[PDB]
Design an enzyme around this catalytic site. Structure first.
Site, short mmCIF file in Angstrom:
data_model
loop_
_atom_site.label_atom_id
_atom_site.label_comp_id
_atom_site.label_asym_id
_atom_site.label_seq_id
_atom_site.Cartn_x
_atom_site.Cartn_y
_atom_site.Cartn_z
N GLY A 45 0.36 -1.43 -0.29
CA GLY A 45 -0.91 0.44 0.20
C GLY A 45 0.87 1.51 0.45
O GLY A 45 2.08 1.05 0.30
N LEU A 92 7.46 2.27 4.93
CA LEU A 92 8.15 2.43 3.30
C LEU A 92 8.80 3.76 4.15
O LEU A 92 9.80 4.37 3.97
CB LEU A 92 7.40 2.59 2.80
CG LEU A 92 6.83 1.07 1.89
CD1 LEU A 92 6.70 1.71 0.26
CD2 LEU A 92 7.56 -0.23 1.81
N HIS A 133 -3.95 2.42 7.90
CA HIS A 133 -2.69 2.80 8.04
C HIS A 133 -2.44 4.16 7.03
O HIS A 133 -1.45 4.19 7.16
CB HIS A 133 -1.70 1.35 8.02
CG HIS A 133 0.01 2.10 8.24
ND1 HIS A 133 0.88 1.11 8.37
CD2 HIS A 133 0.36 2.20 6.58
CE1 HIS A 133 1.81 1.60 8.15
NE2 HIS A 133 1.72 2.33 7.00
N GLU A 134 -3.25 4.01 6.18
CA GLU A 134 -3.12 4.58 4.79
C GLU A 134 -4.00 6.20 4.98
O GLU A 134 -3.04 6.59 4.80
CB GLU A 134 -3.58 3.90 3.22
CG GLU A 134 -2.72 2.75 2.83
CD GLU A 134 -1.62 2.84 2.85
OE1 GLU A 134 -1.02 3.91 2.39
OE2 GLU A 134 -0.43 1.97 3.07
#
Ligand SMILES: CCCCC[C@H](CC(=O)NO)C(=O)N[C@H](C(=O)N1CCC[C@H]1CO)C(C)C
Ligand SMILES: [Zn+2]
Length: 165
Positions: A45, A92, A133-134
């Site tokens: 994602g 990331l 989380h996004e």
């Protein structure tokens, strides 16, 4: 194009993403660049804030072979239950660190597809965790903000050291 991903403690990652009013070509181009960067990373994602484009656009692919590309624009979700779940999440933008983050098990996602058409859905498993989380990325949050101050600082320092070195 593969895009550059900003990392903790880059204050730009704290920017609050602005709503995508229209889905032109410039937006779809970004989406594709976002998918490539994500696959290339590799991650399951990616939200626009992670790459310095502060628009509410989330990209995802929760599958082994790159066959499940999902697009979430102007997302928002709601916990349909008081239930929680512990999951060791990585990011990331916080590379190398993975902490057990506690989040709601069942949520109801609400967004606009690659064309910008509203759709609603009910998430569980990995998708629930991921959109949560996004959507955090769009608001300036990182899984590390659910962590203690000392633990989070121990992390901020490591990266601040790694970064310039
Ligand atoms: C909600 C779960 C994490 C959200 C997606 C992130 C990518 C990210 O930074 N999104 O904003 C990811 O791929 N994280 C990976 C991750 O945490 N994974 C991959 C799926 C399983 C889980 C680790 O157990 C790491 C390996 C980069
Ligand atoms: Zn992330």
């Amino acid at each position: 194009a593969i895009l550059n991903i900003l990392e903790f403690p880059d204050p730009r990652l704290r920017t609050i993403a602005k709503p995508v009013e229209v889905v032109d070509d410039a937006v779809r181009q970004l989406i594709d660049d976002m998918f490539e960067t994500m696959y290339e990373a590799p991650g399951i994602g990616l939200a626009a804030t992670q790459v310095n484009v502060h628009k509410r656009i989330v990209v995802m692919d929760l599958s082994e072979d790159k066959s499940e590309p999902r697009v979430f624009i102007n997302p928002e979700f709601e916990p349909l239950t008081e239930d929680m779940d512990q999951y060791q999440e990585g990011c990331l933008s916080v590379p190398g660190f993975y902490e057990n983050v506690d989040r709601p098990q069942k949520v109801r996602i609400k967004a606009l597809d690659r064309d910008g058409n509203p759709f609603e859905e009910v998430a569980e498993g990995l998708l629930a965790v991921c959109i949560q989380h996004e959507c955090d990325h769009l608001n300036g949050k990182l899984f590390v903000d659910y962590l203690s101050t000392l633990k989070r600082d121990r992390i901020r320092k490591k990266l601040e050291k790694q970064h310039r070195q």
